[PDB]
Design a protein around this ligand. Sequence first.
Ligand SMILES: O=c1cc(-c2ccccc2)oc2ccccc12
Length: 113
Amino acid sequence: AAPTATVTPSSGLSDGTVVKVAGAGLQAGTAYDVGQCAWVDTGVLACNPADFSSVTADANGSASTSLTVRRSFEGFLFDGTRWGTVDCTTAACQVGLSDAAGNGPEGVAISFN
Ligand SMILES: O=c1cc(-c2ccccc2)oc2ccccc12
C-alpha cells in the first residue's frame, strides 16, 4: 500500500534546528528510530544517539517526532555499533528514519545557510 510520510527537512537553516518528522501508514507497534543520520562511510550512514527521539507508531499507524540537527554528532549504526564522529561543517547533513531493522521512508538531505 501507499504510505504517507510527511516530513519537514531543514533546508536553508542553521544548526540546532528542529527537524519535523511525521510518518503515517506505518506498522502500529513498531519503534522507529529517527536522527540526523548522515553519510559516515562509503555506503554507510550513521545516526546521532545524543539528540535522538525514536517514536513508536500509534493506534492510527502514525509516528510524529522532532530531532535537533547538530553540527557534529556521534555516528551510530542501527545495531548499536559506532562508526565515528560525523561533522557537517564543510559537508551537508541529512535525516534518517527507519525501524530497528532498517525499513521505512526514504532519506531526505538537508543543507545549512
Ligand atoms: O545508522 C544508520 C542510519 C541509516 C539511515 C537510515 C535512513 C535514512 C538515512 C540513513 O542507515 C544505515 C544503514 C546502514 C548502517 C547504519 C545506518
